[PDB]
Design a protein around this nucleic acid. Sequence first.
DNA 1: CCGAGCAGCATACATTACTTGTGAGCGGATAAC
DNA 2: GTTATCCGCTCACAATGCCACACGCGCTGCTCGG
Lengths: 90, 1337, 99
Amino acid sequence: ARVTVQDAVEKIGNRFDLVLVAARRARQMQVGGKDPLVPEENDKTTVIALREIEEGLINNQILDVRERQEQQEQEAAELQAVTAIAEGRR
Amino acid sequence: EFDAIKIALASPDMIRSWSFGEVKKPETINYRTFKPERDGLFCARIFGPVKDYECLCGKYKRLKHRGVICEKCGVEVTQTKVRRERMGHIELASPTAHIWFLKSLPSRIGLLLDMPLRDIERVLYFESYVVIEGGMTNLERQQILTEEQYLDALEEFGDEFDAKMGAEAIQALLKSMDLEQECEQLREELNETNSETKRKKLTKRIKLLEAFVQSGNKPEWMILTVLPVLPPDLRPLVPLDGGRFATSDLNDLYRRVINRNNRLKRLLDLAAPDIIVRNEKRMLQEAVDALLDNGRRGRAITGSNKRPLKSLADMIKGKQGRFRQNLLGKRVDYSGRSVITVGPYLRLHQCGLPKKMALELFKPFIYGKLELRGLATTIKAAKKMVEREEAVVWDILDEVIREHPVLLNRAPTLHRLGIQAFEPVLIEGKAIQLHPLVCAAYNADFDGDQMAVHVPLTLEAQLEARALMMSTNNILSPANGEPIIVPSQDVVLGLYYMTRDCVNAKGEGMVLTGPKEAERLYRSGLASLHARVKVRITEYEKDANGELVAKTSLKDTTVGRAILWMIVPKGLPYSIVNQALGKKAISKMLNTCYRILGLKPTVIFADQIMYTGFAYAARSGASVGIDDMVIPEKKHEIISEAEAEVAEIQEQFQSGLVTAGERYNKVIDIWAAANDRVSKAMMDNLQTETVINRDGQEEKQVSFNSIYMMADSGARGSAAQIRQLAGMRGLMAKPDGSIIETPITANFREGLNVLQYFISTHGARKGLADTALKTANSGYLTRRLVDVAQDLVVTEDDCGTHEGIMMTPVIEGGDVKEPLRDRVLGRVTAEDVLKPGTADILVPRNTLLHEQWCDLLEENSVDAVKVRSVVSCDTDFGVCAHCYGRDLARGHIINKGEAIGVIAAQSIGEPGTQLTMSSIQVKNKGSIKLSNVKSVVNSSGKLVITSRNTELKLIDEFGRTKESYKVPYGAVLAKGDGEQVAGGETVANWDPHTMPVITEVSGFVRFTDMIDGQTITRQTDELTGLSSLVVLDSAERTAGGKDLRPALKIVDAQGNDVLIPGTDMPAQYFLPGKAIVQLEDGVQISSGDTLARIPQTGGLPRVADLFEARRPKEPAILAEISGIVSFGKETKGKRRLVITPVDGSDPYEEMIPKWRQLNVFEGERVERGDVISDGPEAPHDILRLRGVHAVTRYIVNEVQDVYRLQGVKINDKHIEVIVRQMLRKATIVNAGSSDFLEGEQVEYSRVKIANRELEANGKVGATYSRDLLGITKASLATESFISAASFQETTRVLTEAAVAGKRDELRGLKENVIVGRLIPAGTGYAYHQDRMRRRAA
Amino acid sequence: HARSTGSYSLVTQQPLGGKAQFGGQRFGEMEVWALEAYGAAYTLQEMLTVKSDDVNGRTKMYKNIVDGNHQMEPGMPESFNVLLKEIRSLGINIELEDE
DNA sequence: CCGAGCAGCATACATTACTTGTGAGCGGATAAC
DNA sequence: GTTATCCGCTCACAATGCCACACGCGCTGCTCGG
Ligand SMILES: [Mg+2]
Ligand SMILES: [Zn+2]
Ligand SMILES: [Zn+2]
């Protein structure tokens, strides 16, 4: 249920950065969809992202650190696999 | 893929490089076989294969041969799309000029060669000769020749003398010229000669040469040798139903040119009859000129269709040129339009949408959803399903738009609100419902006005529309901080009816346990909708910030107000409803609700207001009948009486008792008086005719008539229209503007005779024609605006300056037309404004003046405050956050990225459709201030004024300024400074046509060349007999008194000159012409005595000329410097006039039109910036004299007067940014260590950063003078060119920016729009800062 | 009447204009000024390039939006390349800067 | 012998046509040494 | 007389957006043709 964006722009003191980070999070939740944190009400991913923003648990830093954690896990797993293959080829 | 655009000339090698071949034959397509004729304007061999991935001859037909060329016809079998790209070239059989660089003032070739354009044209077209290299003969390298001179020199010289003619002659002349040699020659020469007109032309030429040699261009390229022909696909021969291919005019021009070329080559091969080939080269030059531009040199009309042909330039310039037609605004494939109904049920963010339109628009989303649910595995199956509209597709569609926003737009999108975002709701029919409030915002009626729809498809755009342009975001105009969501009509009527009070209505005198109880009591039909009762009400409050206390009161109210109270959302006190609640009251209620509760409850509250208003309006059944509008029973009597009056007045005139003009005036005066009488009588009879009784005799009350209920509530129409309907229609206006004597004594309810209707038609057609012209004019104005401020984006957050303007409440002389509160509401202070008690800083130096600080200022009652305007911000290539101040249409300060320029232009241009096309009487009390006043006390205790800049001011008790008039030279003062006077007292009056010669030191007077006959003419005052003298100046009389000059020596009481009190310079009182002097010789003078007495737009075009800052007709000349005045030699072109400085030199003896009145004496010490010959002050001179703050104050005050005259309000930030734009150019004074020339016009930003960088080192900077151009010329001289290109000219700017190689860095809105990438304004600002912080290191 | 997709002008790869030609509405000058008055950067961008031009870009947008992904791959509107070729057809040389 | 394409044609001439409003370069009159 | 100065003369150059509809779009006597 989104009718305004004032709470969101309060959590991010600029409408421009607001829509930017919210579109980034919505793209996350739409393609390669991370599960939406706030329980959706059968709504589009856009308002889901806005709600997750205004609730106070999504912002620029949170998105960046989540991306970095994903990078770390991904690199650790794939490097373990490549070392296993390296032993398998010898 | 890029970050810049470079443009320059194209060397013949470059052009031949672009081409993939040479066209040789003119004919395009064979009709007996629809195939491109070989080596023609569409040949496949040169440009590309017609059929996709298929040879022309038909040999190769498969992708297995992508790249090979056939051999039967020789075509490279690739994608047909390439025919959109490959270009051709034409090896011209002889050089030819380029019509742009020849006829684009100033002609590039002309300035490049120091040759008059007329001779250049006469030698290009083969009707002259030009000698080159200047051989042994006495012929100069630039000299021209006609026939006889040429052949005679040929007889006298067979060699060493090369007089060539035509294009190739000019080509050789160019290629022979050494660029840097002549450049440095003129450079060393410019420091040698005078005057500054030669120096001006020469600095222009050396600028041209330096820009040329700087770029890689070479002058011989300015004469074409190989003409590149446009790709074929871009000039497509479009077919018809049969074989009637519509020949696009470009192919016609190209065929003409190539035909001339082929014929000319054939002639060149056949022994070349000299005059024949001469004329043929002339004809070919003409044809090529026509192709590059059909404009100059006559026309090139097509066969039997009397109209010129679209040349290449014609495909770029104009409203159909690629810029304003396809690049700037391009048609969208993903949208639709319809007609808008009302649909008054949807919520404020929703909007109706027909099933047909949604099913057509969201088709790809529907295909996606169907593929998801697998209800149609193939895309073609899904297309079939949508074609049949199975019962599932509607559920799918309803699902796919549950939150997907949409864009609605009105046809003329004057300002930012012209496009809004809604959520669609499916409806039937084909109309587009939209909320009534936003339709009042769109300036959209329901007369059949159409609206366009758009669907933002990418995720960024969906979320952007939801976050930025959704209706629940735009509730304040970017122009004024007023709320745009105003309940217009049909609800103000409803609420107003719901909140009134019949003195005796069913249910009066009860007690209600609450609002819901009153609602039930009403719906049950037991109590009237409006009767006085005692209702218990729980109005909530916020005592501390956050809390909500409740004070259950028992207030006397009416049932209607109590019912309405069920809608206010736990905020506002009861006093917001208890009133009669008209329209202004509704706006006030909505404003205070947005102020207290925030936004979301306010939009819910506004929607609830709209709903209940419509509901109880319908329940009211407000209805206008013929017997509703009443006529006062005195109107007949008043009109008959005024008729008797005008009759006896006219008889008096024909009886010879009054002049015809004053008779007309008296007649119109008594008619206007009778009109006001009838209007007041009608109003006083209508508004209170309701005389009802309660428990007894009688009571009056405000009327319940349907009319005047649609008026008192402000629902629709003002009392001026009511009186024009029921009361007398009043006077009417002639076509010229004069007013007819006999007015329209009748009214609309009664009949109108034929003549009265005729005059009303005069007026109405005047109005309609005015509207029909002003629409287009204002459109052009706003288009010019948005293309001079389209660059402004707020980048810096704090420029860190101290210079603002001194905002002060405007005072036109009468009341304060605008207090300081609104002129400073929301704009950061430049200086820490302290209260009148000094040493106590009231506000810190960087405070955003939000409303509470304005309240504090009103409390301490400050006169003026310095504020950080935009015209003084120090941001390079932009403007800082603070210098723009409060982000109107919101509350906070602006966010870095909002393109203030475009919204400012829009806010200024939107109301354009509402434009058109002796004594002193104080009013209030208080001290009497007199600023810049040099006056002397006469022999009557008064104070006669002797200076020009004497400004009278009335100050109230609070020390603040209240009134301000301009006392001229020679006014009497009934009071002095610090004199408490009451209003109406005439403190100063003066005869307008007397410029006295009052003396500041008394004594006697002697004459120096004050003689009759020659200089002066003596005549007796035949009425009385006093020997008056008409003293003529040198100019007034004949030449017999040119050198003879009067001088009234202010001598002692014995006949010798004494000084002035304070200084040692006596008063040599000289005379102006037409001086009717009365005081005979030797008669005593009293200080302040008249030694002689000498006599003396409005709408959209006004603001237009103001922004163009064009020099008005005979502008008010000012003084450049200070010093004492002195005339010179008469008829020096214009009469001479010098102003000797205090200590410096006066090298200027400025020339002034002797005929036009000169306001200055000869013994006056005139400070710079003072009126010399009154009139309008041209903005150029205003700036050049008193800096930039003077000119910005002047322009904002003028345009703001123009707007306040029409009732519209515009916040000054926008005009401030506009003036900041139209003076961004600069001129250089010195040269300094910088690489800048003297008269070179540079951008203030660039020269300022150059001075900054030079001051970083030890070297000196160059002093600059801020220029000021009209918005059009300012935009044209923009650093970037593509903007200036698309804007208005796109034929000079292209030539110039080419011949100089002005590599256009985009860094701007319109440029990026053209390119198609993001915009530095919006979220694209974040994108661009990320880029320029990462890509550009 | 509305327009999802359909024909396009051949000289400039834009949708046709007119109810009969099944064309779409025209986003005009004042419309663009309004759209950029708000910070609607991405909206204006997609309405410029991928909606009307960049034929490859718009086919990609179509194929990507039927696949439930509202991301755009913008580019250079062929109208601008047409302008380039027109100017270049004159003696003027206009290029896209390398960087 | 006329039907079907073509190449360069202000139809050869006097076509033609009140004010549109503004800036800007330009050529003949003008002040000065 | 000349050199710079200035004032009337003539020409270039702009004219809101959309929408819809309608209509039309060389020719012609020389040239290729049987
Ligand atoms: Mg209308
Ligand atoms: Zn082939
Ligand atoms: Zn600033």
